[PDB]
Design a protein around this ligand. Structure first.
Ligand code: U1X
Ligand code: U1X
Ligand code: U1X
Ligand code: U1X
Lengths: 269, 268
């Protein structure tokens, strides 16, 4: 991979692997989410930021400040087949004191057509107390020289799905997947559960028949709290709807403390 | 990747990804196992065999015959760091009517030094009845033209770790990790649990302190039975000693054995 000519975005090609594909011989949405995370990490390394998933400055490290995902929105049109080359372009934009946004465009390397797009909202937090804080100007200036100044949004639309409010699933849930625990493969280098694992746990409560007759088009996920290595998770889904829509809730098996919420949109094959 | 000049082996380079590394910024043993599976799949595609993990022929497909792993043995000397290029070379060899062996050599692309090696024993089976069958001559001949004729073993040593008999762990187990279930990410394109997942389940019963003070050097795993999508697994470990462990994977309910193995770890 490499930063583009103007240095305000980063591009990378990936060949789809055998173990990365699902029952349709095409890459899974978790493989896509992993690839976005990989190109994001490579963009941060290419300009001097941390490579631990937090993309911090030396000023942030002294203060114990990190960047954490608040929302992740993905919309796939065509999942790449096993052996296909997929080119992903990524960039960041500051959204004031609220936080920053990382966007992605996925294209077919052969045809050049856009096969998917993603957007994620990030917020600054003290890694020890988990307390949020609005971005300081001294930190803001360190990122501005690496982001486009004019707005560049992967989801420009006036009323787009990436910014819609998500409600809390009401009990009883129509479907459920109980007792989900992370293993060592689900942890990152800092021993935290990888953001992608939560996407897999959300999709576990989708019935197999839906998976076999439909394809995932859109997924919007709000992150509220971390699941520790020694925590157990309950995944809850309810149909809200050709197209099929679901409301999702991830909560801790014990007390029922919310860790995630979202919506998925599927379409008939 | 590509088959080598003589066409009797296949080589491929891989750059270590951010999500593929562990707590010490180097690729996990499951990332290595995934890479071996990827280069093996690419070797099968490059010469016309199936690409579903069974490396099957048109004669086998008509008969509903597949190749399944019986044993997997991996020895790593240096785990590649995040961003390193690792070159893996792989080849197959027939071991008579017992089965076929796939071997691997892992090297550092920069220095050329061998950083790891692996060997796996495969056996032929009817995919529907799970009954094993001795490989016929008509099937043997289809593979011979793609394997070296002289022996080429990643583990040549007489009396080596890859061919040692593994005993069954006695109850009670010193350590355990119970209620392990596979998710959709653990399934392959045929909806079977991926072979690598079993390696992760085996290592789940290793205490965190051992993981934090030691590095995995050797792992030998015998495959006995499949864990279905709707099955629950119990992982059992006991210290037999460097640190050595005896492992057992069994179904949470009846206690039916699905896997057994040994791991060897070294102080960092
Ligand atoms: O990766 C970045 N920032 C960034 C900005 C420009 C160039 C390279 C990296 N972030 C992820 C968390 C929010 C900030
Ligand atoms: O805890 C999180 N985010 C998060 C990110 C990754 C995994 C788990 C949780 N947040 C609280 C304030 C909004 C974001
Ligand atoms: O992959 C192979 N065989 C093979 C042999 C030569 C070239 C390409 C593939 N196998 C795995 C199970 C035993 C057979
Ligand atoms: O069922 C298997 N092997 C296997 C392979 C992969 C996953 C699970 C099981 N075997 C029957 C006796 C020889 C090996």
């Amino acid at each position: 991979g490499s930063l583009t000519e103007d240095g305000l975005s980063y591009k990378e090609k990936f060949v789809v692997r055998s173990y990365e594909v699902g029952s349709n011989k095409t890459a899974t949405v978790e493989t896509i989410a992993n690839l976005l995370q990989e190109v994001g990490c490579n963009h941060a390394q290419s300009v001097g930021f941390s490579t631990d998933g937090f993309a911090t400055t030396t000023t942030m490290r002294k203060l114990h400040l990190i960047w954490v995902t608040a929302r992740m929105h993905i919309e796939i049109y065509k999942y790449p087949a096993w052996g296909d080359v997929v080119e992903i372009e990524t960039w960041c934009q500051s959204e004031g004191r609220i936080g920053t946004r990382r966007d992605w465009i996925l294209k077919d390397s052969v045809t050049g057509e856009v096969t998917g797009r993603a957007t994620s909202k990030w917020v600054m937090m003290n890694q020890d107390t988990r307390r949020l804080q609005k971005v300081s100007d001294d930190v803001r200036d360190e990122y501005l020289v690496f982001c486009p100044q004019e707005p560049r949004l992967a989801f420009p639309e006036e009323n787009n799905r990436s910014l819609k409010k998500i409600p809390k699933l009401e009990d009883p849930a129509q479907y459920s997947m109980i007792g989900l625990k992370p293993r060592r493969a689900d942890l990152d280098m800092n021993q935290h559960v990888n953001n992608v694992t939560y996407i897999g746990w959300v999709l576990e409560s989708i019935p197999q028949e839906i998976v076999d007759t439909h394809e995932l088009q859109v997924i919007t996920l709000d992150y509220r709290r971390e699941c520790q290595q020694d925590d157990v998770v309950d995944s809850l889904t309810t149909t809200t709807s050709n197209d099929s829509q679901f409301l999702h809730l991830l909560r801790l098996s014990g007390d029922g403390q919310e860790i995630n919420r979202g919506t998925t949109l599927w379409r008939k094959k």
